């Protein structure tokens, strides 16, 4: 019981460390430009979209090669919930809201990426099988 | 909620349409003997 508190305290700072990631910024957009996020980028693991405070948070869709649209889990983050984050990086993102749709093309898509050997959102926090058994 | 609707037209009436047309066609062919 003594050690677990130490682990929790260390973790709840390691996450906040968050240093040493590469940020891409090469992103094109085309379509219904009214919905367009003000800034979009990716870290190699998560792709971020930032919408202004005055805009609705649309639905963001993952595109395959042939153009079929498919769901991607998303999480809202940021101080003011103005940043929507998806759990993937891809060449082509489709943004839809109501009946106006905007398409996002990634221009520097990397197939290799960064491997997930830590099992978490961080390269500094590991995940262990405490279940043992 | 609602949007575009399928009414399943063909899947509902095609049976009757095909059977009736085939029956009439066959009767006409029989009549065409002489």
């Amino acid at each position: 019981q003594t050690r677990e508190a130490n682990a929790r305290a260390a973790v709840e700072a390691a996450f906040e460390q968050r240093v040493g990631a590469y940020y891409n910024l090469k992103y094109m957009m085309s379509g219904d430009k009214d919905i367009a996020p003000v800034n979009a980028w990716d870290d190699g693991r998560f792709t971020y979209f930032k919408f202004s405070a005055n805009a609705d948070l649309p639905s963001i869709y993952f595109v395959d090669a042939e153009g079929n649209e498919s769901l991607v889990p998303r999480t809202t983050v940021g101080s003011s919930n103005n940043i929507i984050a998806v759990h993937k990086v891809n060449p082509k993102w489709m943004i839809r809201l109501g009946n106006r749709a905007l398409a996002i093309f990634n221009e520097a898509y990397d197939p290799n990426g960064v491997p997930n050997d830590t099992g978490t959102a961080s390269p500094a926090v590991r995940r262990v099988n405490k279940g043992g058994n | 909620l609602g949007g575009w609707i399928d009414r399943h037209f063909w899947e509902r009436f095609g049976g009757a349409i095909m059977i009736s047309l085939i029956g009439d066609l066959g009767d006409w062919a029989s009549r065409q003997g002489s």
Partner: peptide, 28 residues
């Protein structure tokens, strides 16, 4: 003879960058 319609496909003509300036969350 008619199926479920597809949603609108955005144009492919006007392609322009998103990030006019660096986001601040990149600490910039």
């Amino acid at each position: 003879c008619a199926s479920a319609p597809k949603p609108k496909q955005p144009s492919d003509f006007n392609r322009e960058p998103v990030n006019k300036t660096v986001p601040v969350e990149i600490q910039r």
